[PDB]
Amino acid sequence: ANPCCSNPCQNRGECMSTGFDQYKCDCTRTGFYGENCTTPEFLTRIKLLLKPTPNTVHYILTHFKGVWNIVNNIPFLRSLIMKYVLTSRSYLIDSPPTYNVHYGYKSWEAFSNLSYYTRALPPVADDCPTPMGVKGNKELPDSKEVLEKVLLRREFIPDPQGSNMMFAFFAQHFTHQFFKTDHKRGPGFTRGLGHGVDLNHIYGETLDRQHKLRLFKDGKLKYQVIGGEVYPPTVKDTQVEMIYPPHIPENLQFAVGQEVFGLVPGLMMYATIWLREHQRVCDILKQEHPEWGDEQLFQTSKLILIGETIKIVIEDYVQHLSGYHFKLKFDPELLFNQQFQYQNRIASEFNTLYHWHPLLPDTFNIEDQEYSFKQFLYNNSILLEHGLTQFVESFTRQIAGRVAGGRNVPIAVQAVAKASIDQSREMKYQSLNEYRKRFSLKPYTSFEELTGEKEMAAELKALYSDIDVMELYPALLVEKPRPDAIFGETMVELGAPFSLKGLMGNPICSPQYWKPSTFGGEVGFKIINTASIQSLICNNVKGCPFTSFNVQ
Amino acid sequence: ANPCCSNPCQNRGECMSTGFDQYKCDCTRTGFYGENCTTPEFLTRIKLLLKPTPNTVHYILTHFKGVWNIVNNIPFLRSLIMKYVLTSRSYLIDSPPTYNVHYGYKSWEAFSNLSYYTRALPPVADDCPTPMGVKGNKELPDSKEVLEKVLLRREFIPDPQGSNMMFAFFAQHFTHQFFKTDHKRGPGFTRGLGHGVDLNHIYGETLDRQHKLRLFKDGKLKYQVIGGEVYPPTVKDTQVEMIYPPHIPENLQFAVGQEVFGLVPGLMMYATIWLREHQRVCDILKQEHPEWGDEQLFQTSKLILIGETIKIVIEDYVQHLSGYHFKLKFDPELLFNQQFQYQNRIASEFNTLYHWHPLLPDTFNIEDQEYSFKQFLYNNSILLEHGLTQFVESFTRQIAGRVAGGRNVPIAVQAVAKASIDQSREMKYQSLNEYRKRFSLKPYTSFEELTGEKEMAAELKALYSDIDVMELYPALLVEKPRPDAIFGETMVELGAPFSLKGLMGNPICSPQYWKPSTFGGEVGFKIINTASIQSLICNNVKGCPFTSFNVQ
Ligand code: HEM
Ligand code: HEM
Ligand SMILES: C[C@H](C(=O)O)c1ccc(-c2ccccc2)c(F)c1
Ligand SMILES: C[C@H](C(=O)O)c1ccc(-c2ccccc2)c(F)c1
Ligand SMILES: *[C@@H]1O[C@H](CO)[C@@H](O)[C@H](O)[C@H]1NC(C)=O
Ligand SMILES: *[C@@H]1O[C@H](CO)[C@@H](O)[C@H](O)[C@H]1NC(C)=O
Ligand SMILES: *[C@@H]1O[C@H](CO)[C@@H](O)[C@H](O)[C@H]1NC(C)=O
Ligand SMILES: *[C@@H]1O[C@H](CO)[C@@H](O)[C@H](O)[C@H]1NC(C)=O
Ligand SMILES: *[C@@H]1O[C@H](CO)[C@@H](O)[C@H](O)[C@H]1NC(C)=O
Ligand SMILES: *[C@@H]1O[C@H](CO)[C@@H](O)[C@H](O)[C@H]1NC(C)=O
């Protein structure tokens, strides 16, 4: 019955109901006027007829390698480009935040309550007739059918871009500091109240935890030496709360920080590399500051490690991911002369679009072995069995599945994939098209336009019947990838704006923070400014195993 | 022993210890280079030799009434001026926040932990020799001596600017949503985790509270009709936790929202006016939105009331306070084209500089009576006895004490004044001069320069011996007021930057929020844009008592 159920306001205007069966669009600053913020203002016209499309843009970024190699060596230009990608991307995210599972309207509860993931688009009014608003049928197609028909994996489809199990697991570890659904409250609620790259997955979400994981000597994190390698301390020694199956023999119940990283050796591999890293910096810092004490050593390293993380995430992780030939750059000063909010609130659409389960192969091949999901899970004895060096070697040399394209979700995690479907639904999401539009994309005219092929498209059409009812999660995985890429337009276009705001909207990037002394001097500032995934592994892994997020 | 104890870094450069008995200044972006961020860069030189002083600036703003009457009538100019006071003021506040009681260095703990009030200047290293760093004696002068000698009130000194008990009590009520020391943790810790104008003092700091204070009908706040007037409901009925002396007969234990507002009828007078206001808007909104429900009515009104508050605070409260002839303006768009962070962390220095106890008269004269502190306190029977209209009349017609100038602290709240002295000390504050400098002021060369007279100045010199050791709180109250003003340079120059950031760094002011629909339409947007203290009282008080923050 809500007159805004039809989602009538275009170009980002807001729908306000002014009656019962009447509504109104707040086209403020949308650049468009008219009943539904549709009639563009003259200047809008100009901009529109001059702005390339994500694909043409993507094309240039993907081709002309030579030109790019010139561009990448002319600092001004590089900063000029990065600055723009940085600003244009960011302008797509509401900051300060608005809307959440419970609020389709601004509200102070929505703004102040940090327990909710924010929303890029409001939920759907509960009294709307069809689950996507007004379009489509009384109910969406059965998630089990959707799952099986176009999601489940038949033959493992490797990713053409090259993503290996180093990339796959980094993505798990990294995003898991912020993606932490409080399943006690419901999807839509988070436990990462730090809403970003705060490194809580290393240090603990709370002071008590952090304090239990800490050594209180030279600023270091607690640990243990097994074999000759440095591993996280036990749950029995530290007493931190970790999630482990009742049969772990104790002694393998590592502590770490993010309570769920004991569930997969790939996470614990990284969790150990970072513990190692923290300690390393404590040493580097302590050499510079004989006068410092345990806290300033700790607090300063945590700042450096957060810097390294943001550096690696843009110049290695996202670089690989992008496919672009342009050398992305992590340089805070780029936004010192730009209007930019140094704050972030993680949106559930970024949580949902980030369920990259179609990256997990069918077996984890750790040189001389090929473990099953069943044997890999919760098995840190494998980790102690092979040990980082030959783990970075194994995983560096092991492609991951393709995310976009369709039918690549391991039937092992099919329960998780269906869950993504079911939750988006209970969270009253909007169609893939509403989202596409919200992100300046052109809505798909047919399921086939979506997929770029016919059998899945066909199966979708049978199921959803109207392209304008196609759900966001499924369509992201069942979507025509760009050339020899891992994802399609939708995934890169929604996630990009989200990923860059949380990375650049971190306080260490603010003019007041971005200065040497913040990090313990000009030496700690290099640590951040010279960080790479290769350096992270070289410095903390036994033999300087060569690494990459790309399989050779 | 900390080599930074001497506070060697000038022009806002940060001190980093690089040794044990060696330090270093991070003059980044300070505009100055050289060992102590002292040698100005050429461009700095230009700015410096062209920037008037707070007093000459103040002069112009205080004089030339006619010229101002012209400027106040040419929109462009007015926006042009307000925009600059708004931007220049704000650039004096670290946002994102840095430093706190426990951290003299940036730290993630400092940044993320919302339980601490932030710090404009870092605390003093615990291993520094003298309590202000390196300068002064092993101990500051006895607070009791300082209190009695230059703080306590002899003969009531009324404020030459005109402040009445309407102003005095509004400042109490308003600032008390954000100034809420958690005396169980220690000074330096706050309970207003909303860090600003969120109106928790009306709605409750928490959802549970809010929910108990709420009616759940038409979006209204719970209440009761006594006589014929509308007053807050009881603690018995609602069950909210209020602070009241064990002898309040129940039935006079009003609920309200800020747990300490039952302690003084002046607070409860406002707390009842705002309850009334909320309800009023619920009615206005409901008329516009027959389709809305209890939540949207509630959440929307709260946003409007937060708007009115920011409107009244800049165009009436700060307007009066300022003494300026220029018409201040609350207009969010002024900052839509400016770099500005829409966030705020309340600093303890703002808490301390805001203890305006020298405003309280010796008796509360409520037309036909002159109550003593002892009879006014916790006495809401007086409120029910006289009743808002003749309360706004009484208080409108009653000057308040002068804050600056010296010796005007009611001996009745001398315990609170001494406490301000004690706590600043325990919180390891810095001298008035360090603060003056941090706020682009010229340090006082003598106690007499500070006071603008000799007996107190003399008593101070006996006591502190070095001007450079004079403490921030005392000097604020014992300071030469500007002409016929209530405070001096330091109070206006520190508190200004603070007060404007918290007011303008509110999400409702952000481009995404500042739009009609956010407030329920173009109607609720007027409520905000046409708000005045006179309107607030007219609409909710029995006979439209004329009001003002100025005594005739
Ligand atoms: C073998 C490793 C993996 C396993 C077994 C696995 C398993 C799961 C499970 C059981 C959930 C929770 C399902 C629910 O009840 O809602 C989940 C959530 C998630 N997974 Fe994975 N996953 C793995 C790898 C990945 C990878 C490589 C990514 C890539 C980014 C990923 C991203 C996510 C995200 C973003 C969530 C949501 C986090 C949250 O909201 O708490 N997963 N995964
Ligand atoms: C008759 C009313 C008043 C009484 C009896 C009173 C009493 C007190 C007391 C006992 C404290 C706490 C002292 C401590 O630190 O232990 C305090 C704090 C404070 N008072 Fe007053 N006061 C009154 C009026 C005012 C007014 C009119 C203002 C003007 C703004 C004011 C501003 C403050 C501020 C800013 C604080 C700090 C709040 C906090 O940090 O919790 N007070 N007052
Ligand atoms: C820098 C580049 C861009 O903005 O074009 C870029 C940045 C971020 C992403 C990105 C997209 C989805 C999930 C995580 C990151 C991406 F795919 C591409
Ligand atoms: C707007 C005006 C200005 O900046 O000049 C202004 C702003 C804030 C204050 C102010 C000063 C001391 C305590 C509280 C507020 C003030 F006294 C004057
Ligand atoms: C605006 O949208 C409504 C609802 O979708 C539609 O019925 C109406 O005709 C549209 N009007 C214009 C001018 O676009
Ligand atoms: C956040 O808000 C929702 C509803 O307003 C509520 O269910 C949840 O408990 C809130 N959490 C807190 C800590 O206020
Ligand atoms: C765990 O790893 C060990 C050693 O790598 C392996 O032999 C075993 O099969 C795994 N555990 C399970 C339950 O499969
Ligand atoms: C810098 O500050 C220190 C400590 O106050 C002082 O002793 C030193 O002489 C100053 N040097 C310069 C060049 O300002
Ligand atoms: C904030 O920090 C201080 C010390 O680090 C601590 O005492 C306080 O409990 C912290 N609060 C929270 C919520 O972390
Ligand atoms: C409170 O004030 C009322 C009305 O002004 C007065 O009659 C009464 O004596 C006071 N209460 C007490 C306990 O004295």
d(CA A177, CA A175): 6
The binding site of B for substrate comprises 89, 324
d(CA A107, CA B293): 14
**Residue B516, SS3 per DSSP:** helix
After which residues does chain A break, using C–N > 2.5 Å?
Answer: none
For residue A358, give every residue at least 6 positions away whose Cβ sits within 8 Å of its Cβ, in sequence order, or none: A153, A401, A402, A403, A408, A409, A410, A477
- Kindly report the number of other CB atoms within 10 A of residue A530's CB atom: 10
d(C-alpha B139, C-alpha B198), whole Å = 40
**Angstrom distance (rounded) from CA B240 to CA B211:** 10
Complete domains list, chain A, with CATH: 1-41 (2.10.25.10), 42-552 (1.10.640.10)
- Our answer on whether the CB atom of A265 is closer than 6 Å to any ligand 3 atom is no
Q: Which residue has the tokens 């723009």?
A: A84
Helix and strand element counts for chain B (H, E) = 25, 8
Active-site residue, selected from the candidate residues A354, A378, A429, A444: A354
Q: H or E segment at B425?
A: helix B414-426
Distances from the Cα of B464 to the Cαs of B139, B282, B468, in angstroms? 10, 56, 9
Burial of B50 (0-12, 13-18, 19+ CB in 10 A): exposed
- Structure-token match 């049978």, residue found: A462
Q: How far does A22 lie from chain B, in Å, by closest CA?
A: 10
Ligand 7 nearest-atom number relative to CA A372: 14
Q: Alpha-carbon distance B214 to B533, whole Å?
A: 25
Q: Assign B452 to helix, strand or coil.
A: coil
Q: Is B109 helix (H, G, I), strand (E, B) or coil?
A: helix
Nearest CA to B90 out of B310, B271, B282, B341 is that of: B341
Secondary structure letter of residue A334 according to DSSP: G
Written as six digits, the tokens of A239 are: 């007493």
| Exposure b/e, B11-21, CB count within 10 A at least 16 = b | bbbbbbbbeee
Question: Whole-angstrom Cα distance, residue B457 to residue A438?
Answer: 64
User: How far does B75 lie from chain A, in Å, by closest CA?
Assistant: 21
Judge if the beta carbon of residue B38 lies within 6 A of ligand 8. Answer: yes
Taking the C-alpha atoms of residue A452 and residue A478, their distance in angstroms, rounded to an integer, is: 10
CA distance A27 to A475: 29
Selecting among B99, B354, B444, B473, the annotated active-site residue is: B354
For A361-409, the DSSP string reads -SEE--SS--EEHHHHTT-HHHHHHH-THHHHHHHHS-B-B-STTSS-B
Strands B23-26 and A224-226, sheet pairing: unpaired
Distance of alpha carbon A468 from alpha carbon A437, whole angstroms: 11
Q: What sections of A27-146 are H helices per DSSP? A: 42-48, 54-62, 65-71, 75-90, 108-112, 143-146
Q: Catalytic site residue B386?
A: no
Cβ contact A511–B29 (<8 Å): yes
Atom 14 (ligand 10) nearest CA: B375
SS3 B352: helix
Contact B462, B520 (CB under 8 A): no
Closest to B542 in 3D by CA, of B420, B415, B423, B389:
B389
Residues 6+ apart with CB under 8 A from B230: B223, B224, B272, B275, B276, B279
- Ligand with an atom nearest the CA of residue A482: 3
**Residue B509 neighbours by CB under 8 Å, 6+ apart:** B310, B332, B335, B342
Question: What are the angstrom distances between the C-alpha of B268 and each of A97, B363, B539?
Answer: 33, 18, 17
Would you say B344 and A343 are in contact if contact means Cβ atoms under 8 Å apart? no
- Is B250 buried (19+), middle (13-18) or exposed (0-12) by CB count in 10 A? exposed
- B/e letters for B62-100, b = 16+ CB within 10 Å, e = fewer, are beeeeebeebbeeeeebeebbbebbbebbebbbbbbbbb
Residue B415: Cβ within 10 Å count: 9
CB B34 within 8 A of CB B162: no
Distance CA A318, CA A334 (A): 18
Between CA A543 and CA B187 the distance in angstroms is 51
Amino acid at B111: F
Measured between CA atoms, how close is B289 to chain A, in angstroms?
6
Which residues pair with residue A231 across a beta bridge?
A224
> Are B130 and B138 a contacting pair, CB within 8 Å?
yes
Report the interhelical angle of A265-288 vs A294-312 (nearest 10°).
Answer: 130
The reply to whether omega before B96 is within 30° of 0 (cis) is yes
Ligand 2 midpoint to CA B416 (Å): 7
Residue A437 CB: number of other CB atoms within 10 A?
Answer: 18
Which residues of A fall in the annotated binding site for heme b?
A: 357
State phi, psi for A444 to the nearest 5 degrees: -70, 130
Residue B491 alpha carbon to ligand 4 centre in Å: 8
What's the rounded Cα separation, in Å, for the pair B537 and B551? 16
Spatial distance between the Cα atoms of B116 and B101, rounded to a whole number of angstroms: 8
Select the residue from B92, B108, B310 to test the A interface by mutation, using most A Cβ atoms within 10 A: B108
Does B351 sit in the ligand 2 pocket, CB within 6 Å? yes
Q: What angle do CA A430, A431, A434 make, to 5 degrees?
A: 80
B416 Cβ closer than 6 Å to some ligand 2 atom = yes
Torsion angle of C-alpha atoms A27, A30, A31, A35, degrees rounded to 10: -30
Taking the centre of ligand 7 as the mean of its atom positions, its distance from the CA of residue A368, in whole angstroms, is 14
Per residue, the 3-state secondary structure of A232-248, as one string, reads: CCEHHHHCCCCCCCCCC
Header resolution in angstroms: 2.5
C-alpha distance from residue A84 to each of A78, A87, A114, A350, B430 (Å): 10, 5, 30, 22, 42
Q: Which amino acid is at B233?
A: P
How many C-beta atoms surround the C-beta of residue A452 within 10 A? Answer: 15
Chain-chain contact of B20 with A291 (C-beta, under 8 angstroms): yes
Extract the tokens encoding B245.
Answer: 């002396």
Residue B190: closest CA among B100, B256, B263: B100
